[PDB]
Structure 1
């Protein structure tokens, strides 16, 4: 809905013990690929994309997985790991398109689904936050950082979520919310209400 129709160019499919996503970036001069550990079969998966297909082996910390792949001839955007404790708007580079979301203090918010595990999560400045791990199917996200630390699906204030969205306040209306959200307001910035109603 708020997902693009096509993935970004550096987004890849990643198949190991299940099918998920990943992406390719230039980090520390080297072209690398990140995804979620749990989609790999052991430490390996077949990484496919436009003009690419090759098995790769990943270094792993918790659900975070990274690999060298110097055969990538496509674009590999520069991306460093963002500072720990960074919060803000971000993008989930999934295999079925880019979905917008939020990285907050101890939480993540984004509408994701099966096949999205492994998606890179990057800041609006292109810095890498981590990779998508999973969700409660209601916007409550699990993101894992290169350290291996992660956020769980914990209760959040609608008011706190709202701080990450611009636009004048509008009534929620009949828009259903998501059971991990503490509904501490019936009015929300328009960008957020448009996102919530698109779920």
Structure 2
């Protein structure tokens, strides 16, 4: 459940501890987002492809955002996702992009969520928050939702493809197996 390569806008973030982050163009400005607890006060060394620099961050709860105008790399356009948004989401971790879903008052990732500071973005490219603390997603307001197990039938709601028997596919403990029929794309993802 992880791409081979991290996205080009994924960064390492090192302050008082070890984290990662992401770079986006938000209201016309290039910003870096990460987890506030990894900073040395509000400062960290941020590094990625073609970039290595100290940044100072605006902190709200465990959410942190910095202007980074010297960033010359990939900085996809993003706005914060709409309040109440639910759907498929993506964790941008230092070792690759990992799928999951955001539902009402919870998140679920198919794998571990990366370092603290991993951006969580929606299927339309909007920023949900960053992974902190298996774990929590902290939104730009500093409020959070916990990563929780999910019923297999609920997870199905986020996937397409005709219903197929789940058959012998093994599913981890963070999926509550309450059905044995699932949309084909979810079956295929789980079996990969």
Q: TM-score, normalised by structure 1?
A: 0.86
Alpha-carbon offset, residue 69 of structure 1 = 1.0
Alpha-carbon offset, residue 53 of structure 1 = 0.5
The answer on whether the counterparts of 2:161 and 2:183 sit within 8 Å (CA) in structure 1 is yes
Alpha-carbon offset, residue 161 of structure 1 = 1.3
Residues 177-192 of structure 1: matches in 2 within 5 Å? Answer: 177-192=171-186
Separation in 2, partners of 1:196, 1:141: 21
The answer on whether the counterparts of 2:114 and 2:131 sit within 8 Å (CA) in structure 1 is no
The answer on whether the counterparts of 1:108 and 1:140 sit within 8 Å (CA) in structure 2 is no
Secondary structure at 2:189 match in 1: helix
Q: 1:114 to 1:86 in 2, by over 3 A?
A: closer
**Shift >4 Å, 4+ stretches:** none
Separation in 1, partners of 2:149, 2:111: 18
Alpha-carbon offset, residue 23 of structure 1 = 0.8
Q: 1:106 to 1:25 in 2, by over 3 A?
A: same
Aligned residues between the structures: 192
The answer on whether the counterparts of 2:108 and 2:149 sit within 8 Å (CA) in structure 1 is no
Worse overlay, 93-102 or 178-187: 178-187
Worse overlay, 82-91 or 165-174: 165-174
Q: Which deviations, in whole Å up to 9, do the C-alpha atoms of 1:113-153 show, x marking residues without a partner? A: 374321111122211111122xxxxx955211101111113
The answer on whether the counterparts of 1:107 and 1:141 sit within 8 Å (CA) in structure 2 is no
Q: 1:10 to 1:80 in 2, by over 3 A?
A: same
The answer on whether the counterparts of 1:47 and 1:55 sit within 8 Å (CA) in structure 2 is yes
Separation in 2, partners of 1:125, 1:53: 29
Q: 1:96 to 1:197 in 2, by over 3 A?
A: same
Separation in 2, partners of 1:112, 1:184: 20
RMSD of the alignment, in Å?
2.2
Worse overlay, 34-43 or 46-55: 34-43
The answer on whether the counterparts of 1:142 and 1:153 sit within 8 Å (CA) in structure 2 is yes
The answer on whether the counterparts of 2:108 and 2:147 sit within 8 Å (CA) in structure 1 is no
Worse overlay, 81-90 or 141-150: 141-150
The answer on whether the counterparts of 1:153 and 1:180 sit within 8 Å (CA) in structure 2 is no
